[PDB]
Design a protein around this nucleic acid. Sequence first.
RNA 1: GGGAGACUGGAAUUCCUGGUGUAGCGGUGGAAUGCGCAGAUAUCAGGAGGAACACCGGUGGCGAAGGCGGGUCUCUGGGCAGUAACUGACGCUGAGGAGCGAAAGCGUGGGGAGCGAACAGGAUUAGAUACCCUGGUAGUCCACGCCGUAAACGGUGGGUACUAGGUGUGGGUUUCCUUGGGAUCCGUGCCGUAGCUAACGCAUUAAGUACCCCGCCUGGGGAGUACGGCCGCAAGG
Lengths: 87, 32, 96, 64, 273, 228, 117
Amino acid sequence: ALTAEQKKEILGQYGLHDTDTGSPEAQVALLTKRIQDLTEHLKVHKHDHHSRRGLLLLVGRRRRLLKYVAQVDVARYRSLIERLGLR
Amino acid sequence: GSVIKKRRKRMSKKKHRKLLRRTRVQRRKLGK
Amino acid sequence: MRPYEIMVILDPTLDERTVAPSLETFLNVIRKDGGTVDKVDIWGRRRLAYEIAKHAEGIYAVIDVKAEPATVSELDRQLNLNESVLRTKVLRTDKH
Amino acid sequence: KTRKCVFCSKKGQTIDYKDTALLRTYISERGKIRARRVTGNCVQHQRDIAVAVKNAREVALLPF
Amino acid sequence: IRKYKPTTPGRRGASVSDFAEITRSTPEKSLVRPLHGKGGRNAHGRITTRHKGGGHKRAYRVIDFRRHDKDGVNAKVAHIEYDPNRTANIALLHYLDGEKRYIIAPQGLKQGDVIESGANADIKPGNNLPLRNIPAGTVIHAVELRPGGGAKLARSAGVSIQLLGKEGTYAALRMPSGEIRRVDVRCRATVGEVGNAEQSNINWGKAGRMRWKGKRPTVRGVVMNPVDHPHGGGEGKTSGGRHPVSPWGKPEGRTRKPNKPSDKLIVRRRRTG
Amino acid sequence: MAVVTMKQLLDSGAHFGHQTRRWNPKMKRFIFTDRNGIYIIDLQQTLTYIDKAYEFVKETVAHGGTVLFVGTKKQAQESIAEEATRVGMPYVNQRWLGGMLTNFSTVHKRLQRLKELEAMEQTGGFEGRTKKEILMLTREKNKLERSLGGIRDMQKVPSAVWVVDTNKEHIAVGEARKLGIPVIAILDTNCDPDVVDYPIPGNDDAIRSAALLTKVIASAVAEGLQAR
Amino acid sequence: KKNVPHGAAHIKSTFNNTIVSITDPQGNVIAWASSGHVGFKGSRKSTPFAAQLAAENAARKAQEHGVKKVDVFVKGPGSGRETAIRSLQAAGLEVGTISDVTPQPHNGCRPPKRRRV
RNA sequence: GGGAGACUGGAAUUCCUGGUGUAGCGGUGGAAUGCGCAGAUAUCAGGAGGAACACCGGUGGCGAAGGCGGGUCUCUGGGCAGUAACUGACGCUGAGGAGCGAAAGCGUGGGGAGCGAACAGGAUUAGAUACCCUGGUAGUCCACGCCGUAAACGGUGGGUACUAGGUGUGGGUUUCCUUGGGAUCCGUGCCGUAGCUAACGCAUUAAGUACCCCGCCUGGGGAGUACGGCCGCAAGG
Ligand SMILES: [Mg+2]
Ligand SMILES: [Mg+2]
Ligand SMILES: [Mg+2]
Ligand SMILES: [Mg+2]
Ligand SMILES: [Mg+2]
Ligand SMILES: [Mg+2]
Ligand SMILES: [Mg+2]
Ligand SMILES: [Mg+2]
Ligand SMILES: [Mg+2]
């Protein structure tokens, strides 16, 4: 899991406003950070074969959130994409 | 359910595998 | 840091007077790298339940340290390489 | 004895592998581990016991 | 290991050492010494060891196997180079004193790490330590055949020796050949396993590769004439006409050192299979 | 594990036998030697099976099963009545009814019929009905009580069955092993030992031993109840 | 020869035969007996009478050496243990304590599957 | 006992060494191969290697399904409840495709204790290439990849709304006593309403009331076989 302080500061950074959680951008940022943190552990324990399922689930959730964000608005989607360096 | 129908397919597959084992050499060297 | 407990079973041929200084020599690394509280309990001449490296009795010691995984692993490695000590055990006092 | 539990009921206790005195009342005569029903303990504290007695046997605090 | 594509007939299924863990490409000109091939000919000039011929000239790359001195003086590794005379890579150490030396570079020895010889050194791959201070049940390599006589055991790649329970003035070592041998405890050893373990599975592919190393062809004695090899030629493919025998009439037997030698240290000979 | 020893069993007189003209050839394993023409049963084979049955009941309690009681005697009506209500187990005292374990679709109707009567008793209807309808219920009680004494509270289709006096109740133990459910019982020197899944050496004509056996068999369920 | 006031008799009993061996507290065996040595062969080696006679012969051989106090240890399951103990105590020997010593492999080595007969 | 990685220990099988010790040991429904007399089996002490972790330990826990049992540590997936402050339809299925996928088998690198395909012998049988016993190479194990087939059975697809209860269990929360009991929310057994079901049976964890989506079945053999193609070193799918 992610540390409380790290999650709090990530939310404060990528939040639409103060005391904001679960928003589209916040969720996308949290998922991106989780994947970036899990890739390092996978590079070592490539023979896990179980954490890869959670990785794929988180990636699918991130893709669905990005699809919803793009359907809602395109400017926000492209800004988040260029800010997080994805695709 | 019953075992008659299962053993029928079992014997069929066994005969097929026996034929394949017998004919393996006919394509072993012809494959390589 | 994280809290941890360290149980140690030393050789019965030693003396409690040299047990504590020996443990302090090893905890030198913790106090110079982690700088944590030190609570070392010692009780010697305790008979074991079965033979342990050609010995019937020994000296038990319990230490508590709020240090890092690398530090506790280094301490365990040093204790396993040392000959004056016989057995070591590292536990996590936390709920997990 | 034979109540709900001594750990789950009394609300105050601690399962310590170094507590050979407390683990002697739970290990069988020969040295094995007694059943859960004879002790009357919740699953959590039963597993805690099991692991504590295993650690004791590993550190040679019991006759296995 | 890097496998060559089936481009040419010589690279059908050939492979080569990945050469990983190597930093530099040239040796130290201050330590390199000269040496010329001998082609298997002794001082008399006659071909003694057959299959020894023209090979690429090599350097010596003096390697210290005693390590008796510089006990408390620490030392760090500088580079990892290749050595033809050895079937493994070597490491260049920058001793705190100032001089440089070479070591077999055991496995798991990265760059930058520090090593320390002597008796009070910590048990870790890369440092030399006496058997008296090395606990039993560990893994060592290249200790010696005699105190201060020079490391002469388990120097190949991915090879090592297991030190069993020592007793008195003798410790037991299980050579990689499965042979258990006793050796006095005053010997200086080296913790860790030899590096380059990935080698020994390198398909040379063509005969030219093996010839470059100074390995001439090996003619079987069956096709030879009766005056050359006991396995006379005969009319047609002959299995030998007799039991297997060396070209000098020595049969495939024990062929061990002379009976009753100074081998009282051996406790258990190896196993054939 | 263990809960009793052979010292407490020797005082109960559990090493007696019967005449040599009413035995079976396949009961010569428990005998040791003939002395004055009386049979004797070994003692080392008792504690083992006792602990085995104890642990089996301890496990079946957690699994969702309990032990039952069966009998046909008409002299020990008091021994099987006091200890029963302590744990709340089934038992038969006077009349061994037919079709109580193998047949379950018939006893449930009589159970509800008796529950209706025991619930209506709280009203006290005696005048609304004729004298004959009330007089019939008096004899109906004596007719229905001598067969079912503890089958009202089971309501759990237990997974463990215990039988006693197999020599006379062979049909009970015979139908117990029908569905393969674990069966336990005590055997005699004039019966079949292979019919019980887990035999327990013990005499059938010893009240002092039968009481202790029933007590130790019923305490196993309480052991798990007080813990659950 | 030698004298041994206190000793221990190990009885290894299996589905084929029973071997009873008396030994000093150190471990130097002195006497031993077996059903096969008594004269029985084949399946007759598994009967309780054979084990009893072997235990009696062992007790006699021990008395020949002058051993009176003898503890008893038994191996895993097998018929003849109680009969051998009875014969030992009846032949003029102290039964002492009975400490069962049976190897308890906790899933160490996979044994055969099952005997079909 | 969710997964990967590192360290660590007891019992027990086998071998070897230093003692004791005999003429039998092993083994079957009864016997013989074999192992001993060239010191067997057996007992005391020590050393070596490979695997698994009795008792806790089960209709009890986890995982989407395989599947997951000794102890310590690093990383990490997934699940339930309260607080409901956070966006407000982003909910569900999924043709092809991708991943995982028990056990066995395959290439390479090591080891190999027990068991053990094949293979040698022993015994029964008119005939035993098997059922029984003695040895046993692959395999079983660790490290890097293939193989994708199982009764991979709950022979029950995935999500949600609804349809008497009793009896158990595990999970974290509040009310009533003051340890005792009820309700609330999820997984996992049994008996039973209506209902469904050819019957067996399901029955709040549906096989019932109805909605959304994919795959499959339209008589048994031929044949899950033939040709072509797909991937695979091969077997094979
Ligand atoms: Mg010649
Ligand atoms: Mg010819
Ligand atoms: Mg698909
Ligand atoms: Mg496999
Ligand atoms: Mg066999
Ligand atoms: Mg299929
Ligand atoms: Mg049902
Ligand atoms: Mg084709
Ligand atoms: Mg096909």
